[PDB]
Design a protein around this nucleic acid. Structure first.
Lengths: 97, 176, 328, 96, 172, 387
RNA sequence: AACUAAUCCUAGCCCUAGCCCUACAAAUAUAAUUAUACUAUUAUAUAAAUCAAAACAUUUAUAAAAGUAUUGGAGA
RNA sequence: UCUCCAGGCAUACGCGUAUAACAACUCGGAUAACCAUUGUUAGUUAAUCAGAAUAGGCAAUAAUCACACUAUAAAUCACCUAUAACUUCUCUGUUAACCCAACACCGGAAUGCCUAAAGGAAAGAUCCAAAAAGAUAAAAGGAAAAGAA
RNA sequence: AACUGU
């Protein structure tokens, strides 16, 4: 779930369960050379690597061994006709073994 | 599974993939609460697979087969959410009568405007929260000048649009 | 230069480490005075009971290091007592030097890489690696251990070759002082080694690894630590003798190490045959490093009341056999 | 998780969301619908419709029988408070 | 960004980041003592960066406290602090704290307080000595370094002897 | 007295009866135009350690009116030796026990190349052990003692009976006793305690123990015996020997203490170190007597002997203590006997790097004024009770 | 008949009349836009001067009766 | 491959995609080649590297290889006694030939290691004008060497 | 004084 408020948890509160997930992920061909088990994924910036492990293991029943994630800075050099800088949306690349 | 992230191997390389119309709101309403929850994931799974294919297509600089499929899924997902929300909204009013899921009230900002303030969850009460009290919900005396400008600005806006309309009317007279 | 952790959670790190070290890991042990075996069991059994049930000490504040702290205390007590009991049988133990949680460092070069971009784009630079290890305990002697196999020994097995770059597997490079250290300075008379003792952290212990689903990595963790620690320790010893990349060792350098998770115990033996790992120095080298390792085995089962249950003599016999070994 | 003193991270299991994935086996609904299937006119659900469908039949039966009183509003489905339910309508205590 | 540096809660003899907390109320009953005469030992004569005169560490019982050093104060000397008003002349050791009633007329004093309990505020500079011009019943006349003669109650504490650097006032 | 602290930083509608003034409580935020509400106590519903405050001492169930004075490692006695003797009701005999000196006189006890091995140990403990050019006392001081113990640890070959003792780490010793109606407690921990299956031989005969009645504890009036001790009102009566009951080695042989602080101001003076050893060593001896003979107050028929060694890595202090009586309530009567050896210098100074002036090595990399006798005294204590 | 150039009509505005007005999520005054505790939280005295009096000083506007009676370095 | 030159590499700070591949040849580099330009696509992976409970009790003695040894500019929480909590690995930073000076400005720009193994190129072509500037050389003499006041 | 294309 993204762009939403999660219920505040205090001692004795229920476990946080997301019955419907707003996180959307896409598998991308690795730009760099990676081990075959390693897989690249583009995921929302608010998702944690643990969530991806739970997401793949639960929704897709995919077993995961290790995860490495990076945040790519979007280029803002481009400008429009009005001289307003255009920013490429920042995305996170996840390396899932 | 990983195969679910990708389209049917047979469909790979095809110009398009045959797909029907998106779920309408009325049909989703007929479906049960449990059915609605399951359908959300089914639409979500298709949406993710289409997103994965589209991203690869952009990398390969190739056209996406049947792009309307993603649009249909998104519309169905949006229809599902409102139908579920409608049931949630109806029950909330019945049991509590509150017209908004989140506590809120109308408050005056430091600029003199009246805006709906959405309440936030805190572990301590407001009076024991100095930072929340530090937040200003009162208008300074100098805002009186701004209030007059707002009334004048609103009057000015009406004049400007009328002037804008007059210029458009010139086109009608000029053309005919 | 790449920073190498002797204990690491990286998947298949054992194969990657062997490629970086040019070491072949053969499964099992290297090819090959009564002391009342029962008496040692009682002595070791008492040592475990002393710390766990008899000693009185301030409770740790963290409450998480308690399990780790207990394992360190029992291991230290057992080792110290065992040396005295086995010292009369093996005079080497009397003259040996025991090191407690001291650092062993080795710096070696294997392979090369081409700069992909920047003001130095296209220039060729060597792949640098550094290993810093602090074995729980290690024994240093002034005489080389007996060789387990003649130098130039050849086996059909081939060292692993890594297709991807080292960085692709989690690994980061940093620029700092390069150090080669045997556990003591060159002035120390004990320039050779008897044995190393390693303690795996709780994160890599069997219980957490099984929960993490990396059950198969338990043996990999044992292999990676043994190969990295022994190679660095053995390589540093050879350098103390003046042997370097352009002057390869004339005599095989051999050492052994034991890695324990607190209950299970594993035994590893390493033989160093080549100090030439650079492209130029390794341009024409048929020799390779050979490592022998054994699976981890429990030493005892549980501590009940003031009597330990399930103590395994077989693991102790290997320690006794290892301790009794001496140069000929 | 929570960052406590000494700059140490301590993950809290309860605050970590758990993805409840329904079983799609036996579910007849798919991402798309037939063009052969006629579309249904949108009829958004409202409190009036919800009350009529669920609460009205009970009261109508009870009113004719005469077994109706103000004290038993909870009997017909009124909730005095949202506390005790995992999902509270107001204030909202669950994520989408 | 200005925060007062004189915010040390606990009195200590160790230099404070250095500043040494001086005590100008000489007769402050130390720990495990009644408000009766007590004695202290001059441990060391140190140098005070923030004052012209040199401070001598005076310690007694379980309390150690810095004080101003008199003309003849030296390391290892013994300093007495008495609240009792002597019926006869009280034995005077330079640096000792005694009521003006105890001392006889003509004795050089320093670190005097204008009002009982006020604390030493004058004759705190190097070479400054107060002369007891007159003594009658519960009132005494003390000449301050400004040459202003003031009359105070005998309860006020006076330290015998001149301040260190006896020739400070004679500087050219 | 000069006043410290800048003065800048120094510190209707309601009365109307039958009605309640309006307040911004409903607004949930402060506004100057509404009255300040009076808020009732807030209830969190759970306990937050970050905002929790400890309950007062007096409300504790363990609070006791009588003051219990606790002596710990950091405690520094104002009177030093004199206070320790009064608190422990012990009589001091100058020099180590005659038996202890005779231990090293045995040729078999003497180590082969003892001076050379000790010199190598000193060099190893100071320079070779670590990669740093000049290691600090915080590092080498623990190591030198262990290395010397290791050198003695090799003597088990000569004497198999030495296998009957082992050393434990971070053991805690504590006892509570009364002196002239004053409640005294000693708390000691850390270091290493060597324990053997058999009690150390008694140093003083029963006749000598009876003679101690003549000795009178020195007093330091008006300073109270409890000066420099931590006065505690919430305490428990406990006796600790460093091990749980049933330990195979119930008899403690030696009690070590290490002062590894690099800076001299951070290092306790030799007199204070011995005073700490006396109280800590006395507590361990007292704990053994109380366990064996109970909490009753009486002269011990079989005295208990305890040894303590304190060193900072350069200065070594050797202590031997014999507990003769547990009737410590009175200040007169049978008294314990303690043997003290102080200011045993292993070496005057050590250089971890060569001192070169004008291309001349003025000082070598080795101990200066090395005294092998200090190790012999250390060796004598370790071997005592076996040979 | 030539290159550089040039050509265009509305973009919109202005003055009166009329008219008072009452027009997503998420995050935010902490360091605004930082999903939960810190740290309590807060504007404003005649308007003056410039200017006019050719400087400058009291002074200097801001329906008819009538610019009359009056006031003013009786002067602007 | 040859000739020759000799501050290089990391981090901080700042910059914010200038990074890398491909495709273009119009604009930008004060010319080309080639890109630093134009368009498109890709990129920087961290449990180890870096950033993001409370109440009482009690403290005399610098460092300088710290020992001797002196000195003056005067130079370091801990640990005890109680109370409270009770099983944890997420988030963020990671590219570059890069910054402050209107500029691809002969300017300014901290720390650590090391001094060539790292890092580089003064020659757009031709002519050899005068005049001018810089550098080297001087027969005989020495105001037409480094010594004194 | 020497020194030198001053």
């Amino acid at each position: 779930a993204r762009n939403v408020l999660y219920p505040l948890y205090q001692l004795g509160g229920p476990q946080l369960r997301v019955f419907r997930t707003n996180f959307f992920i896409q598998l991308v061909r690795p730009g760099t050379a990676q081990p075959e088990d390693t897989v690249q994924f583009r995921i929302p910036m608010e998702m944690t690597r643990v969530d991806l492990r739970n997401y793949l293991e639960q929704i897709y029943n995919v077993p995961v061994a290790a995860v490495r994630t990076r945040v790519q800075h979007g280029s803002n050099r481009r400008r429009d006709h009005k001289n307003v800088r255009i920013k490429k949306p920042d995305y996170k690349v996840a390396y899932v073994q | 599974g990983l195969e679910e992230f990708f389209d049917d191997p047979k469909n790979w390389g095809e110009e398009k993939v045959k797909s029907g119309a998106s779920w309408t709101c009325q049909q989703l309403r007929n479906k049960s609460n449990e059915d609605l929850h399951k359908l959300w994931y089914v639409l979500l799974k298709e949406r993710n697979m289409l997103l994965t294919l589209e991203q690869e297509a952009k990398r390969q600089r190739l056209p996406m087969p049947s792009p309307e499929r993603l649009e249909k899924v998104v519309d169905s997902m949006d229809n599902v959410d409102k139908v579920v929300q409608e049931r949630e909204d109806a029950l909330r009013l019945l049991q509590t009568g509150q017209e908004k899921p989140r506590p809120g009230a109308w408050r005056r900002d430091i600029f003199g405007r009246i805006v709906w303030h959405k309440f936030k969850q805190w572990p301590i009460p407001w009076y024991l929260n100095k930072r929340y009290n530090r937040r200003r919900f009162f208008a300074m005396p100098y805002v009186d000048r701004f209030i007059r400008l707002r009334i004048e600005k609103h009057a000015r806006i009406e004049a400007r649009k009328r002037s804008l309309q007059k210029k458009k009317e010139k086109i009608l007279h000029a053309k005919f | 230069k790449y920073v190498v952790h002797p204990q690491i959670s990286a998947l298949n790190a054992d194969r990657w480490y062997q490629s970086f070290t040019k070491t072949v890991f053969v499964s099992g042990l290297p090819p090959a005075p009564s002391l009342d075996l029962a008496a040692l069991r009682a002595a070791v059994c008492d040592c475990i009971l002393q710390e766990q049930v008899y000693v009185r000490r301030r409770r740790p504040r963290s409450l998480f290091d308690r399990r780790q702290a207990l394992a360190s205390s029992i291991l230290d007590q057992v080792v110290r007592t065992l040396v005295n009991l086995l010292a009369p049988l093996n005079p080497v133990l009397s003259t040996a030097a025991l090191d407690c949680k001291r650092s062993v460092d080795f710096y070696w070069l294997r392979g090369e890489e081409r700069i992909p971009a920047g003001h130095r784009k296209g220039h060729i630079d060597a792949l640098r690696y550094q290993i810093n290890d602090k074995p729980h305990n290690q024994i240093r002697i002034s005489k080389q251990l007996p060789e387990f196999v003649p130098l130039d020994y050849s086996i059909p097995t081939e060292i692993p070759v890594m297709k991807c770059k080292p960085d692709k597997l989690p690994l980061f490079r940093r620029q700092y002082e390069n150090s080669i250290f045997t556990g003591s300075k060159t002035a120390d008379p004990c320039c050779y080694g008897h044995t190393q003792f390693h303690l795996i952290p709780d994160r890599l212990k069997r219980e957490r690894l099984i929960r993490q689903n990396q059950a198969e990595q338990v043996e990999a963790v044992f292999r990676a630590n043994a190969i990295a620690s022994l190679f660095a320790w053995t390589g540093a010893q050879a350098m103390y003798q003046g042997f370097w990349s352009e002057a390869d060792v004339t005599r095989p350098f051999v050492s052994q190490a034991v890695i324990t998770d607190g209950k299970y115990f594993s035994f590893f033996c390493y033989q160093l045959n080549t100090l030439a790992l650079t492209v130029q120095a390794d341009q024409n080298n048929p020799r390779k490093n050979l490592c022998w390792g054994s699976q981890s085995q429990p030493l005892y089962e549980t501590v009940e009341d003031n009597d330990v249950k399930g103590f395994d003599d077989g693991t102790l016999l290997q320690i006794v056999h290892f301790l009794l070994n001496k140069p000929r | 998780g929570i960052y406590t003193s000494d700059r140490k991270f301590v993950q809290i299991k309860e605050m970590v969301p758990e993805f409840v994935v329904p079983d799609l086996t036996g579910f007849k609904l798919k991402p798309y619908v037939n063009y052969r299937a006629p579309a249904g006119i949108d009829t958004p659900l409202t409190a009036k419709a919800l009350f009529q469908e669920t609460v009205a039949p009970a009261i109508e039966k009870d009113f004719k029988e005469g077994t109706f009183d103000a004290n038993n509003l909870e009997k017909y489905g009124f909730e005095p408070t949202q506390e005790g339910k995992l999902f509270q309508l107001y204030p909202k205590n669950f994520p989408r | 960004k200005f925060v007062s540096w004189k915010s040390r809660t606990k009195y200590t003899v160790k230099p404070v980041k250095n500043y040494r907390m001086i005590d100008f109320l000489r007769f402050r009953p130390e720990k495990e003592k009644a408000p009766e005469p007590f004695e202290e030992k001059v441990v060391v004569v140190r140098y005070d960066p923030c004052r012209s005169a040199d401070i001598a560490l005076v310690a007694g019982g379980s309390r150690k406290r810095w004080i101003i050093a008199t003309e003849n104060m030296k390391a290892g000397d013994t300093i007495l602090n008495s609240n009792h008003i002597g019926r006869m002349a009280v034995a005077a050791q330079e640096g000792d704290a005694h009521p003006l009633g105890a001392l006889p007329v003509g004795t050089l004093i320093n670190n005097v307080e204008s009002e009982p309990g006020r604390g030493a505020q004058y004759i705190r500079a190097a070479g400054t000595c107060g002369v007891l011009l007159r003594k009658v019943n519960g009132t005494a006349i003390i000449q301050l370094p400004s040459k202003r003669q003031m009359q105070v109650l005998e309860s006020c504490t006076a330290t015998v002897g001149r301040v260190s650097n006896v020739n400070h006032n004679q500087r050219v | 007295a000069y006043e410290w602290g800048v003065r800048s930083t120094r510190k209707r509608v309601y009365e109307i009866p039958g009605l309640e003034p309006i307040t911004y409580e409903g607004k949930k935020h402060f506004v100057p135009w509404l009255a300040r509400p009076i808020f009732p106590p807030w209830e969190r519903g759970w306990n937050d350690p970050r905002f929790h405050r400890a309950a007062p001492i007096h409300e504790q169930t363990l609070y006791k009116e009588e003051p219990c004075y606790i002596f710990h490692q950091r405690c520094r006695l104002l009177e030093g030796m004199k206070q320790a003797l009064w608190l422990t009701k012990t009589k001091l005999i100058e020099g180590l026990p005659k038996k202890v000196l005779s231990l090293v006189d045995d040729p078999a006890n003497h180590i082969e190349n003892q001076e050379q091995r000790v010199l190598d140990i000193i060099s190893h403990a100071r320079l070779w052990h670590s990669t740093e050019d000049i290691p600090k006392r915080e590092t080498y001081c623990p190591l030198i003692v262990d290395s010397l113990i290791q050198l003695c640890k090799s003597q088990i070959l000569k004497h198999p009976s030495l296998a009957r003792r082992t050393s434990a780490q971070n053991c805690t010793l504590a006892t509570t006793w009364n002196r002239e109606s004053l409640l005294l407690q000693v708390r000691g921990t850390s270091s290493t305690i060597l324990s053997a299956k058999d009690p150390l031989p008694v140093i003083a005969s029963r006749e000598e123990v009876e003679a101690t009645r003549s000795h009178v504890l020195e007093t330091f009036y008006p300073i109270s015996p409890t000066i420099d001790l931590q006065e505690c009102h919430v305490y428990e009566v406990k006796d600790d020997t460093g091990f749980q009951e049933g330990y195979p080695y119930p008899h403690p042989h030696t009690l070590y203490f290490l002062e590894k602080a690099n800076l001299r101001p951070q290092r306790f003076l030799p007199e204070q170190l011995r005073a700490k050893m006396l109280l800590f060593a006395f507590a361990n001896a007292l704990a053994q007597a109380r366990l064996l003979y109970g909490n009753t107050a009486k002269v011990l028929e079989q005295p208990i002997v305890v040894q303590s060694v304190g060193t900072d890595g350069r200065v070594f202090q050797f202590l031997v203590l014999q507990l003769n009586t547990t009737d410590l309530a009175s200040s007169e009567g049978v008294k314990n006997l303690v043997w003290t050896d102080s200011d045993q210098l292993l070496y005057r100074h050590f250089w971890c790097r060569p001192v070169i002036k004008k291309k001349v090595v003025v000082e070598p990399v080795g101990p200066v004024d090395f005294q092998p006798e200090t190790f012999r005294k250390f060796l004598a204590l370790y071997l005592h009770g076996v040979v």
